[PDB]
Amino acid sequence: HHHHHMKPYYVTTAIAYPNAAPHVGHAYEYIATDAIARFKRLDRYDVRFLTGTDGVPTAALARRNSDVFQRMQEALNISFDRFIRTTDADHHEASKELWRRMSAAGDIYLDNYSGWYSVRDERFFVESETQLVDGTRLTVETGTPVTWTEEQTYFFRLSAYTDKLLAHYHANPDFIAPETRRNEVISFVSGGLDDLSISRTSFDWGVQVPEHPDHVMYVWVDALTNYLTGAGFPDTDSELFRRYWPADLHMIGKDIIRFHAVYWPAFLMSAGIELPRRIFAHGFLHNRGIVDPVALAEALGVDQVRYFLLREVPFGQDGSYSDEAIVTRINTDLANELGNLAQRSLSMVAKNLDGRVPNPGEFADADAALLATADGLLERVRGHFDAQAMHLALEAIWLMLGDANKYFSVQQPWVLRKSESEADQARFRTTLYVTCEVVRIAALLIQPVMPESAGKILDLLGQAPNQRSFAAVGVRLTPGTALPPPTGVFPRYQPP
Amino acid sequence: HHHHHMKPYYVTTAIAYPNAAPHVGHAYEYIATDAIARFKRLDRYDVRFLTGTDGVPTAALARRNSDVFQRMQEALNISFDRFIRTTDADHHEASKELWRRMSAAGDIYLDNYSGWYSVRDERFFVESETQLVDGTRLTVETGTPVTWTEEQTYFFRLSAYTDKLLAHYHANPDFIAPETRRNEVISFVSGGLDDLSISRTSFDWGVQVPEHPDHVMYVWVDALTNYLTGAGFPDTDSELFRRYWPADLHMIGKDIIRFHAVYWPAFLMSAGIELPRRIFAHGFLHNRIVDPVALAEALGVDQVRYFLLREVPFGQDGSYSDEAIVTRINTDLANELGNLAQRSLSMVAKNLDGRVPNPGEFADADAALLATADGLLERVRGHFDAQAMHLALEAIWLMLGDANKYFSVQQPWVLRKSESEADQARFRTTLYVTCEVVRIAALLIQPVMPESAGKILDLLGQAPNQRSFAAVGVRLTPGTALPPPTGVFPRYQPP
């Protein structure tokens, strides 16, 4: 009964709230988290990569959510793992069990409350958190209407966890990232926290509170438990839960950080459940002077868009999109620096070395320096990925590709091809081998960012599909390997 | 510059040879040696507990070794000490220095030789040590193929140390254990020894012989020096070597006893290096191969550690069966130890406000049980010093038998019902005595079942700083607050 060997890694994308519809607006988040998951799969991890998502209006919306999810997954090549339907997941047993544990811990109480309530956010707001935009009172943070409501509601004793949360932040400095987001959460919690309304009296459809069917949970309370549902909760003895909980990484947008970094860990502390290891809040994309990567991918190519978004924007910051910025990356970074270097060297293998990887001679100093830089990339890229700094990992790879192109232009293997010498031909073989070998290493490491284009390059280098994990980075290109006739992988931008 | 104050104790598990894979098949060995090391740490020793281990086919095989090691260490809770890698260790300087010393002493010579050679064992074999099994010539001892080779090789003058080895066995009766293994080694050496080939001419990867780069040492010659490397050798003036060499105990399987009890001490005699103090060769397990890692994941790490160290007299071969381990899980652990702790701790919680009672004056029955418990540490220490962990565990559970008998005779559940003044006093005394002997037993079983014993000590309100053997002589403090009792030893759950 051994169906797994590698260390597990459980990573989630964000719940939909405050949007009723999942997936929409999450393409950037999905591309980034997919690259993280693909990197972990290539680095000998058992990856579990899941979404944070689970009358007549509600059901057709379920078809649209499905259609949007399939299109986004296929257009951007997201490799979410397949979740198995269970009876507990259909009946919201996770949030009901979480409620039971928090109630049994003494952290849930009924009370009367009056204040500004937002139907869309399902939250209460204080006076300073509202504003009259134009004779209509809206929330300052989200812009949703509020009306004054006097309700009976169940509260979570969030105030009893202010210091416990600050102690968790101090003991786990990598729990919240990037650092500007960590400083903001610490500043917020340090000001003190009030108790948190978590239910409403309603007969509308929703997750009924255990023992109190006249109350229903707010949508975001039950939504957060989807992370636990993804690991088989409330079946804490199940193999799924022992293996994958706690989650290693919650990937979210910075708009819902307080739900994940304050409310969520307090809920889990109250219920006696292990907390997630890390929360990373990314920024949002805007046009220069909203950005739809699915439409960009269909127009420009999936790997061009995935590369641009993960390279142009330092992950965590807000990003600016201009057509000029992505055209340069498509034409310079991809088509020229990587594509043309691979095409030039592979063309000489096919035409002058009978389509066979040459056996290199003894490596000169210039050969060893370039190989040493490439051999050191896996360690540097792994460190950047562990901090969710994919832009720095891609910059490191293209810095090596810069050295490789410089090396290629200095060695001039296309002029050594002519000479009938014994030393020029040996130098011809060695320089082509070194260029192919560093292209192989770069192609292996860009698989998380551009899976198909990297796969095509590895096909051109005669690498079987079984020899494409990061363990293969330390195994040099085999002389005598037969290479297929080279074809283009990274085309130049074609204006409409 | 005092980073130590206790007497050092250096104990090793065996080198991998003949198998190229370390750790594989050594789980039973690791568990027993870990219990010995844990006992020494609790007994005010500075313990150094190390393994005897250090192209493309060899690199990823090193990844598998690390995976097997970390999984085995975690599944069985083995507490090997952390080895610091140095420049000398990376370049195999210990075996080079050992070879130099033996050569400088005149004990290594080059010679021609012809005979049956096993590339797997890296040893030569005489005709009577080979056999044709089905048209192929194998060693009778290990079943590896041999081919007739006529090679130049370096020899160690083992014949010059036959009598010196016998004199060492006689002067040090505890050097080899158990006694059946000692008798076999003495009989072998008494028959006389030939000189020992220790190198081969090959351009494969290996430890090149100093001053003769065409020869490489046999893998087991270099492997033996890992024991020296663990103590900082060849840096004989290092703090590690002065403090931890000679090794106090080489724990090995009896399959490689001649490498450790004959070749190894003769090497060290030639090199002028102090000999290890003691070598213990344990037996092998079989079903009526046994995989303790798989057993632990299915049954519980402490259930498996206990069964393996109690069921088989250490040094003998053992037979593990499902019924035999179920008996020890349910009787020895869940009932004899578990329910004795649960029934008495539950009475402290419900009847004595979760507070250790202040006992009255001890009756003859109370003092008799306490006396048996107070004498356990000395008896268990003597068994561990002979590596007789089965006898240490038997001595502890014989006391737990007396405690269960004492508990049933006193009937504390009857005394709690009486509003009398005398009965309530006797009720406090018998509960204190029962908790006190459970505390002593839990302290002494820490080397065998670290986690379960820690849980019992948690239920008895013992802080983590008061769990060494120096705390055995400090009675349970009346007034100590106890957490609500929870289960520690579950009964066997059939799948």
Numbering used by the authors:
A (entry chain B): -4 to 49, 63 to 297, 307 to 513
B (entry chain A): -4 to 49, 63 to 296, 307 to 513
List sentences quoted exactly from the publication behind this structure:
Methionyl-tRNA synthetase (MetRS) is a member of subclass Ia. MetRS is unique among the essential AARSs because it not only charges methionine to tRNA for elongation of translation, but also charges initiator tRNA to initialize translation. MetRS is considered to be one of the most promising drug targets in combatting bacterial pathogens, including MTB. The catalytic domain of MtMetRS spanning residues 1–115 (the N-terminal segment) and residues 226–292 (the C-terminal segment) has a typical α/β Rossmann fold.
